[PDB]
Amino acid sequence: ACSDTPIAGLVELALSAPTFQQLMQRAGGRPDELTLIAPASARLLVASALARQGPLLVVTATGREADDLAAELRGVFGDAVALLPSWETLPHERLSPGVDTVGTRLMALRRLAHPDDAQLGPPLGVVVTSVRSLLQPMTPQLGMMEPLTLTVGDESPFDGVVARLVELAYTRVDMVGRRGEFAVRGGILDIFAPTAEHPVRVEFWGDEITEMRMFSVADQRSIPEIDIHTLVAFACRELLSEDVRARAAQLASDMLAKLAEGIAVDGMEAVLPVLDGHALLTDQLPDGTPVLVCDPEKVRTRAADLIRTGREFLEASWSVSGFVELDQVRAAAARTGHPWWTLSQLSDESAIELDVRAAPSARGHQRDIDEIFAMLRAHIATGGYAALVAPGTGTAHRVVERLSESDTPAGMLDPGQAPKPGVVGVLQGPLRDGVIIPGANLVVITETDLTGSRLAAKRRNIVDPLALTAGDLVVHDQHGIGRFVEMVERTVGGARREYLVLEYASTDKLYVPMDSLDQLSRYVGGQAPALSRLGGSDWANTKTKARRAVREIAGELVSLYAKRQASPGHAFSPDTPWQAELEDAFGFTETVDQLTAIEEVKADMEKPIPMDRVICGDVGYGKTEIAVRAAFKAVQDGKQVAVLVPTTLLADQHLQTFGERMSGFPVTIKGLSRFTDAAESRAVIDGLADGSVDIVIGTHRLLQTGVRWKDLGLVVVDEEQRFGVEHKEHIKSLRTHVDVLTMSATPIPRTLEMSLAGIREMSTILTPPEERYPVLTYVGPHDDKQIAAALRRELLRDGQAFYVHNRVSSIDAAAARVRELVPEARVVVAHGQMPEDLLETTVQRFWNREHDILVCTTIVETGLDISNANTLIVERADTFGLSQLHQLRGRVGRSRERGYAYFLYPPQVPLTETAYDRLATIAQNNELGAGMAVALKDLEIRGAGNVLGIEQSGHVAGVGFDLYVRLVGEALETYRDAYRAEEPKDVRIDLPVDAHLPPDYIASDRLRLEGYRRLAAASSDREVAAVVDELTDRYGALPEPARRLAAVARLRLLCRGSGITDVTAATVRLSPLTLPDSAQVRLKRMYPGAHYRATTATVQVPIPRAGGLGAPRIRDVELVQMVADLITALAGK
């Protein structure tokens, strides 16, 4: 059928087998009891047998066991089956669960009560969830809870719409950062529904909606690709009318107290039982629908585990139950008209055994696959039906190439059709493990049955709100270092003019206007105060003695461009036909903003010129995956590659990632780490020479002397910063003759990416925020239960955890202190003072699941990417700068597994409220906003710095980082334009005009400075008239006070384009721009009253009065276009 149900063709065939027919026949009368004993590898069509007959809810053991099944049902039943997301936090945990998890659940519950009302989607047929939602004492008023539907033609009032948003647990913010937020512009509304991949911008005209259009949180700009006209945004919590406020104060203290008030606080979810009506899920299911149960011996145990965690968390909350029993919840199934069906793979003669059996499973060794391809190569001979299922179309086509290579007929199938009678009609599908049904002579083998073991990047165009906290420190170009105090307004003459005040050392104040924000930036160099430059004539010396200092970095960085352009090299052939068969192992839809990272890195390879490209990203994987795509093209042209890493752990992480991905393609991928014994070295090195090792991945061992590649074609270096000094040069002597591919994690500002775009082509990738699942942050006193009670949670799903402790004198002692809390777990110490041999050993055990908890220091937590350690705990978070935390919890929640983060402070020693501003900031609007974003802007130190040369600590403290990397930029631009075979000064304008960003247009302060900056830095009207295209997209049509602000901006450009410094005034006078008698008299008829001086020009001009005798003045608008005309007339335009 429709391509969205690809696997339905294969399943409808298997279901035709009689073993399901009777199973469908027996489960056709809705028997109040049932018992089936079939292999667990076939949970999908067991439901797909009961599903279309009886619309049912299925229960999986874990959440992952629900998702893997929920896709196996969506692939056949399209969107008729919806996943019911299990929760994340325990009912009495102080962490509100994920907003997406809440809404995605609310969406499901309203589909139940209104399946025929397809206001959002088709009627639900099947539901999937773990037990943890089945035991949820849900307040039943959800399917009867109305969301806030909107439509373009609506008449909904402004202040009423927000009044329901704020009632639906929506957090007002400056700018929309995450799901569950919203902001109000002037008559324009920005909200973020939790069930959408993108937020929206519903535009109002009084009480009539003018427009609805999504927008990308990255740059907060809209997108025109998809136009929508209606929205549905369920609440973010499972509870807050005026009814419960009384039920809060009448009964942690501030929580219910603020709950009684209009102050919603985190952790409200722990007050659901107090605020009856324990309507279980069977009391929310539609009338007369059964419940399928998988692995009872698991869910039973799983039920107990969820139960004990409850009391384990309640008694943890008593530091200043949970789910109902399974049998009682079961007692309502046959009490509310709901059968109870059992599934199990354990042998049984009492129940109904199904004739379906398991399927083979090869792990890596192709020899076993020959014993599987032959099984395919024989069952089809007896007219048998068979088709290999795979997740990726590119891989599915490889199977056709791989089966025919093994002397076996094959062929890709149309999505939604059964396998052909005789051929292997390979079909893309999300099935996990193969299954064989003799009831139709049918055999299906998923690609996982060979791998045994089983998400893209994005480009950059972002914003920068000038968050300036009082007492901060900034660099002013023409003046020098400063100390920031406050943002002053001044209504002098009816017209506003906002300013910024800076404090100096001594002629002590300085109001920087809004036409000079491009000349300000933070200070990062000294990491400590320096001489606050006084307004005088010594700071300029510090500048002039710095421009000369950049020559070494000027000549060197521009030299590599000369050498690379001189030395030609192998231009790689275009994309091998095999390329678009590895790149499509995932059924996901590619993003035309992730392609541009490869086509950038590809075309650079495709030139005869070598490649000098750099990737600076935080994702860790999405850029790592880019390597395998490039390294695949290279060896396809017959040119072995080399991959460099600074940690032997990284050599193994990548090698497994490479091997798993490059499994099924003939490319040798041997590796060279420290723990690869020398008996394996001599096989690698020699294998490198004879052209057998197609791909080598190794530590600094690959740099030492006695190595040689047979015409190495591609070098990939990962996180150059960790590499040693003398190793950092042996790669500098390597970028000249081979297409190196540098990749780092230091975040680079958007200056370098364009400041040096001809020299070193750098690129910055970042996982788009609307696609990252945030980490549930907690901030509380240092309790020895809440830690341990949290530890066992992550430990339940066989995950690990980071327990950081900086002060190296206690970490050894504070290590065992953990074990007394959790002795059942495994803990290890790790820090920088550990020698080389011990550290990469202790860490390598960690990645191989020989341990459960890592007592690391702030360093080792960073630079360690673990696909399972989704739990962070931080003792004494009061001693940590705001930035490090953002790096710290970045390591948790990278994969699909949602991650937590526990920040702790001493028990009864009250922390400074300044530090309270720290730990509150990390709790509220974390990923971006006012506070934390100001930190990662200061992250330009390593970003702008360590990406090029290093921090010359003596030549920065006094100029600051931002001014350093900005200085070599034009210094390189001087060297760029130099070989071909001083810019004008600043202009000051003071006109009686209303040119300001009014607060009623831009409510916030920082969001107002960016527009002031983003417009005062534009270099051409094309750029000036461009920010307007952004402002109306974000805040609405420019009011007349702003149109003048745009007007004077162009007037500056025309003035600068004509050599003008001061245009001052009823006597409009301009700069010393001199005039010849040719035009010096041309002004007569043009403007009579004026006059001019040949030496000190200062062209004086009178103001025009319209009308007759009443003597007004020409309107503000009519003025600027006049001044923008006489300038054009003088020079001639």
Curated annotation (Swiss-Prot):
Couples transcription and DNA repair by recognizing RNA polymerase (RNAP) stalled at DNA lesions. Mediates ATP-dependent release of RNAP and its truncated transcript from the DNA, and recruitment of nucleotide excision repair machinery to the damaged site. SMART domains: CarD_TRCF, DEXDc, HELICc, TRCF. The keyword Phosphoprotein does not apply. Interacts with the RNA polymerase subunit beta (RpoB). GO terms for biological process: regulation of DNA-templated transcription; transcription-coupled nucleotide-excision repair, DNA damage recognition. This is Transcription-repair-coupling factor. It comes from Mycobacterium tuberculosis (strain ATCC 25618 / H37Rv). NCBIfam families: mfd. The gene is mfd. A motif (DEEQ box) lies at residues 718-721. Residues 604-765 form the Helicase ATP-binding domain.
